[model samples]
Target: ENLYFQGLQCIHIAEGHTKAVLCVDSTDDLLFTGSKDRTCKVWNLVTGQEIMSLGGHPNNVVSVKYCNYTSLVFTVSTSYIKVWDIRDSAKCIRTLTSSGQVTLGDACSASTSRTVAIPSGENQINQIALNPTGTFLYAASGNAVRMWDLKRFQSTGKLTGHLGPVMCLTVDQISSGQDLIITGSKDHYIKMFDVTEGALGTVSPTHNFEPPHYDGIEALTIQGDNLFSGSRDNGIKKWDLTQKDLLQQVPNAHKDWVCALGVVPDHPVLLSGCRGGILKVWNMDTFMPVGEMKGHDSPINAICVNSTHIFTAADDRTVRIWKA
Candidate 1:
């Protein structure tokens, strides 16, 4: 019953999400997930039980996070952002429409008298990260990113630069220094920014993680001076920021674009989710494979782990939990 290879114990099925699982989070006493099925699922992490299914957007759900202090879960769809209280589980508490161009409502007809529903405009939201304090939620949509005040769920500002879609994000919360955000994008760039200033303000490029063979960075995670990036070109490249160059590379990290990265605290262990629905465990210090966890026949889109649990949600529309 122990999958040292899997590193999780409590496994549960969120049975109704029909498409790929796009993102997941654990908050308070629960697990939150978003999927291409246009739904979000709330599960009890301790009991491996499905507690709720939340829906709002009519499109694919791409990213999600839950705030520990608020017991609120935020989900990102291709066109909108929805927030929910795990307690209710029946209705969306707040929905933030995409901030794009606003057109006239009946103003189109009257040209004077006006009324607007403030429709959520056209945009694709792909990634989201909640600040450790649960004060803000940073979301990256196609070619743009924005920070929201979580208390009010309103846009604080936007971060812009990538020539293409923002695919993945990681926040390093070490208290010894300034916080850093690592973002991977379809534009073939991996950027590191100091979020202390503001959204996308004073952004600087770190060493571009351009592995000659890797297509583009799909997922990223940083620990101290060490950074790890997973790519569509079927490899995971390790870079030591202190050296300013690639230190070691795993040429066979995954068969497809790597979708998620999770690092264990105080250890060299790293977990990677792959397009092939495979979960790979790596010993980062050695650039070696620790083991492989297998099951899903589709691709894995997001993965999250705490000290005791490892969860991988896949295109097969299931979230698998393992005990470390």
Candidate 2:
């Protein structure tokens, strides 16, 4: 923790994004950023050089995942997810629409007092997580988590248990070396399931966590057997996945809703950001405050860390780079 604490400092600011960047992903030397302005910007991570701007989504590019196994970059918007083959001029290879068939645009435009009708099953795309082996993807949509075959870019299956939109998902490999998925939802429940195809190619909850959060879950990250969850209620909880019990929690983790939870690889530290645009660093062992990054002007939606560098994307329309 002290290594990063002493060495971490803002080294660069990737400012080409026309709008707030929502997600950041890294693979070796490449930095992938998804923006609300509907583009994914690829950059040379080591040199902080802009390599390319990949535009395909008509809505916000909420998430980006870079897969080294196939050199594919995944980008997601409100209603659909896209695959881009960066090897070929960063071209879009495929687009898969959400199974819900309803985009969040249909539910927007909220009014104060008028009884405006909103449609259910709005798959506004909370985010997407790549499988452990990078062969498939798990997408969190309206009350469901769907799997997509990365090879063919086709829908493989769906998992349903939540009563509201699935907000966050974290995939992990178990002791026996099999992938397991855990998802937090707007319904306030956390659901866990196995990755193996079962029961006619559909997967549902093998376990549902008890003592629901007071509000929707907004972000989730797993480190070892510890699962860190942030909620719309401004609370953050650390759970023992092995024991499947809540170990510690902060009722007010932030001044605003905790929207992002990131764990520093190879270090005993966690980085959390709130909708109020504050990014706080904490000691993973004690779960106590250590430092905070105070640069972005809006919500910090995504944080990515490597051995020596950290990348943060936020509503400030920039991707800030910090190096130790």
Candidate 3:
């Protein structure tokens, strides 16, 4: 783990977001950032050039995800989710509103899901994710998890149990069978659902971990049987799935709220970001502090890692790429 951290170095800096850079996603040669400025910007990884600026959202764009296989990009603001066709001048091909019905393009497959009525109410969509197969899309808003069947482009189901806003979620990409959907919420609980059933059968969680976080649970990551959770209470807990209990706890993991958690690709180190903009690395095997990376000047809202690099988005309105 120490050796990996030793090689960790910031290689590029991309700045453009006028407000907080809330989230970022990347492919091998591109990066996408969603900002409070109500826009999403695409970047070239090799030259750091601003390739395009996507605009449509009426409010801050909180999350952005790039579908590498489909060449589709998804961006979500408080009131709408806009799907763009990057192959066509970054055109907004479809828009899903929270309170009304929307159409899925005719080019979509027959079984593709279409957007139905999504009640925004007081809850805002804070996060969005796509399954490895890209057959489904999931969005977490106030206390509920909404699923979309991308092939048909329609609302498939909704999962609700979190007492507060759902802050973050992750799908088990490694398991080909019984894919698990894990969610973290402001209510401090960590819940798990079987994607096979929840998406196609009943819309409910299969397991609810008890003794919730002291404050809101904001970020989560899983590797093998170990599940790591970061909380606004400045704590990080490691849960052992095989034993069905808490395995370890790192108290005050950050000076402020733990805003993001990511695992280095194919490595044992866990990367954690705090509201104060500090990033720390941890040894997953021993639950020991490895080191820290200081770059962003404000809160780190998101982090992503691939085999060769790490990307961080922060309230400082900049996205920084680091390499090991």
Largest lDDT belongs to which candidate? 3
Q: Per-residue alpha-carbon lDDT of model 2 for 260-298, expressed as tens digits?
A: 888865567787888888877778777887776674788
Clashing pairs in 1: 7-323, 7-324, 8-322, 8-323, 9-322, 9-323
Candidate achieving higher TM-score, 1 or 3: 3
Q: TM-score-based ranking, best first?
A: 3, 2, 1
How many clashes (backbone atoms < 3 Å, residues ≥3 apart in a chain or on different chains) does model 2 have? 0
Model 2 Cα displacement at 105 (Å)? 24
Instruction: List RMSD in Å for every model shown.
Output: 5.9, 5.1, 5.2
| Number of the top TM-score candidate | 3
Evaluated at residue 88, the lDDT of candidate 2 is 58
Q: How many steric clashes does model 1 contain?
A: 6
Report, for every candidate in turn, its global Cα lDDT versus the true structure: 0.69, 0.77, 0.78
- True-vs-predicted CA distance for residue 47, candidate 2, Å: 1.7
Better-scoring candidate (lDDT), 1 or 2: 2
